[PDB]
């Protein structure tokens, strides 16, 4: 379908693996907000959107309706499970690289299915935990997903970085390199 | 590998000419196969695969379900578009233009919104349309975009950028 | 405010 703007006013996700769920709203491929299903709060991903209020109970009840529908298809479809996909990974910077200036590294993991992935950052072989953030599972028309992970840093000539992606569709963890 | 059973539900709205043309499509997806769909141009549920036939057949037999689903074009899509007119659609982020040499030339147009943009290479007030390879539009994910335009040069070069958020196009010079 | 679309339960 061709249109000027596309909005997914309801990206509902529920999977049987470790009962996981997700509720997000999207507009033109960007995430407006997501509901923390554990803390029962709406988290806005754009500051201008914080003026609105979205009842997190709706997301909880809606995911429960998906849980009921999924349990019906598990019986009817004679237990046809999801097929694993081979994800593509790319690492790049948000702004041009100048030594000493604050910047952010962006690791894009595309063609994700099932929506179960581990994304970590490595600096010269060692793991990095501080300054790491990511989005939710952003939806595609292929009915797969893609997730983006961020890492704030001060780039120097002595530190290289890696993005470590773990997925069931990979025979081994995928590492993508980046250097100033 | 552990087995997984995935279920998705996408309540989508498509807008063209603003509110002149609005279309609603609900999608019920088992793993990656859409099984049941409600298209606003059809007016009732349609089973995309045989697996969703009992669901679509029963839902079309409830007059109150079809009534709520048919009115969703005005109550959900057109209603939320009023909020988009003063938030996401208004968003204007001016791009930062930078030229770096690494016989090539890389005009880095970073952090802008919306996605509408045009980058042109000039060589002595002459648009160079050959030797220009442009990367696809890169979605940063935080509601900003970036794009890099390459130039195959042999040695003033200026990078021309047009974006809705600008009052006058930005030009950056090299050598 | 943001108005969403609920999913109908299967019979």
């Amino acid at each position, epitope marked *: 379908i061709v249109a000027d703007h596309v909005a997914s006013y309801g990206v509902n996700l529920y999977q049987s693996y470790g009962p996981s769920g997700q509720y997000t709203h999207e507009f033109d491929g960007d995430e407006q907000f997501y509901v923390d299903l554990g803390r029962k709060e709406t988290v806005w991903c754009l500051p201008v959107l914080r003026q609105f209020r979205f009842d997190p109970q709706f997301a909880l009840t809606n995911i429960a309706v998906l849980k*009921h529908n999924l*349990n019906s298809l598990i019986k009817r479809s004679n237990s046809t499970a999801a097929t694993n996909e081979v994800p593509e990974v790319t690492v790049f910077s948000k702004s041009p690289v100048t030594l000493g200036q604050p910047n952010i590294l962006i690791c894009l993991v595309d063609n994700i299915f099932p929506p179960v992935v581990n994304i970590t950052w490595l600096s010269n072989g060692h793991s990095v935990t501080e300054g790491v953030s990511e989005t939710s599972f952003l939806s595609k028309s292929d009915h797969s997903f893609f997730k983006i992970s961020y890492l704030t840093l001060l780039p120097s000539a002595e530190e290289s970085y890696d993005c470590k992606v773990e997925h069931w569709g990979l025979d081994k963890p995928l590492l993508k390199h980046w250097e100033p | 590998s552990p087995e997984d059973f995935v279920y998705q539900f996408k309540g989508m709205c498509y807008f063209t000419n603003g509110t002149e043309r609005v279309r609603l499509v609900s999608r019920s997806i088992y793993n990656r196969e859409e099984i049941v769909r409600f298209d606003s141009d059809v007016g009732e549920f349609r089973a995309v695969t045989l697996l969703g036939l009992p669901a679509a057949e029963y839902w079309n037999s409830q007059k109150d379900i079809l009534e709520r689903k048919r009115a969703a074009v005005d109550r959900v899509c057109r209603h939320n578009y009023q909020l988009e007119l003063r938030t996401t659609l208004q968003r204007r982020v001016e791009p930062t233009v930078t030229i770096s040499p690494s016989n090539l030339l890389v005009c880095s147009v970073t952090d802008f919104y919306p996605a509408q943009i045009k980058v042109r290479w000039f060589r002595n007030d002459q648009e160079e349309t050959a030797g220009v390879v442009s990367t696809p539009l890169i979605r940063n994910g935080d509601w900003t975009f970036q794009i890099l335009v390459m130039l195959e040069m042999t040695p003033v070069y200026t990078c021309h950028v047009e974006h809705p958020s600008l009052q006058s196009p930005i030009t950056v010079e090299w050598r | 405010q943001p108005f969403p679309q609920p999913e109908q339960p299967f019979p």
Partner: T-cell receptor
Amino acid sequence: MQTPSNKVTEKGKYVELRCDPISGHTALYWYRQSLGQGPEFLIYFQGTGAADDSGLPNDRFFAVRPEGSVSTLKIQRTERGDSAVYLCASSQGQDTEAFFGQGTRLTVVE
Amino acid sequence: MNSVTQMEGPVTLSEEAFLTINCTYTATGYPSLFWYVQYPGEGLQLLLKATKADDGSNKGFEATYRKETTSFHLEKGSVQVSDSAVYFCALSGGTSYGKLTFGQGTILTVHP
């Protein structure tokens, strides 16, 4: 739909209310009607899992529907404020015809 | 806010009298309005409903969905003795998954 018409309970003890919905109805709703009031929502089941628990007043209230048929509402450490009629309704989802039960009238005695 | 405020106090009428039970609502979006009757000794049962604007009629009872006044007033031109019961005005929104927001009841007693 509901198994006991009336039940008597002593303060500080637990009670269990049972509701057997109509065969095939996947949605089940629990309500509470105090004296001189209208029914008020408690919990909504969609199949075997709970979908909305916002109506439960406190942690002493808890419901379950194993098998996605019969549902049990258990009130622990009952007080005289828990005395009301506990209604039960079933349907096939929203915008489908809902059928209410006769209700169980609970009376907590000191 | 999803509230239903209807008439209170026992309404006392005679045979073949005119009945009116006011019901006003306040809801954020587009709601469906209901009327429930609870006869003595029995449970709740749906009397009539309405789903759009300017839209129910069962057993001679009549109610019109009015968005201009946010009303769903019940009316009957000739009440019977068998109408003696409690009447509940209800409401359910498009994002409430069929949950019903009731009001306090209105007791009706028809003298023969």
